[PDB]
Amino acid sequence: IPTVYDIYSRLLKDRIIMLGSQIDDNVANSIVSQLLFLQAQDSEKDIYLYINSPGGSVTAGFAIYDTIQHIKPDVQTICIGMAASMGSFLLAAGAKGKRFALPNAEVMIHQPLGGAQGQATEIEIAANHILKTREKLNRILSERTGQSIEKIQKDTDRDNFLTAEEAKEYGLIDEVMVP
Amino acid sequence: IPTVDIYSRLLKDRIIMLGSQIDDNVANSIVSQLLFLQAQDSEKDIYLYINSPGGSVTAGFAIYDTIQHIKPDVQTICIGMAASMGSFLLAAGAKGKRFALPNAEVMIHQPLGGAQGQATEIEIAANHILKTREKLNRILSERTGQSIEKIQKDTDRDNFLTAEEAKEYGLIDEVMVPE
């Protein structure tokens, strides 16, 4: 809305990217582009990904994830308000030591959601695929948090809401950002 | 609408308008505006003008945590309506610097939500919203000086207050009288 450059463009000049909505292919295309732009401008300075997202598409999220791991600069992550589902996955994906949440922010982890219809064989293909997707998510979360994959499996079985302090204890973030 | 864009012109004076329902868009913008103002000048007060029926709790907390995080005092002024998360944010203003115009309406009440599915999913959702209410009441207590027990009872149903009643409650510090 405000000008002042619209406000987000002004923040992008300071290497701040805003993931402030549902994660779909369009949002991922913008975030990826921003990350690639920033890295081309300066391959060494930190980038700051601020996250207020309920999550969304896993493959969209992974486009952002893989870009983050690929590029040279450290991507800091800052959860404002909420990081749920793929949102929390990305929060957890920030550079080691530089993943933060504000004191009243909400982190939520859970297993992936999907759908399948058709013939038995088709359902089975769709089932296999989403189970593989989950094991890929869980394995990455394990490596990023320090928790066993079995513990991740159990704690993502249903919607699991964590305070910022709990997200820190869990290993999803490094620090609660105190005022 | 009119040119002199009037809201951008007011932002040059460090005035932020919260003039709508609180959702993730509004939060991302208010949070950005706050961080921007702080970058320009980390000592000059900011003024948050509130005419809002509330909206999302997590969105409201992104704004809240940003207000508390920055160095500038954020003054709040209720014009027209501050309801639900609107009134929470009114109360989050720098102490001594929360105001309402004389005919402004403040309303407070418990969080609203929803849950569907298995008994276990409903439980999780119930626990989550009860936790959210406790967090809201704890912070509101500390801001108003009222006990958690009182806040709990007063918010059980929609509770409308005059500006003067909001002042006596501790949600604002002054009713802004005319010259």
Partner: peptide, 6 residues
């Protein structure tokens, strides 16, 4: 959000 991000 500085200090420290940025």
């Amino acid at each position: 959000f500085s200090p420290x991000a940025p």
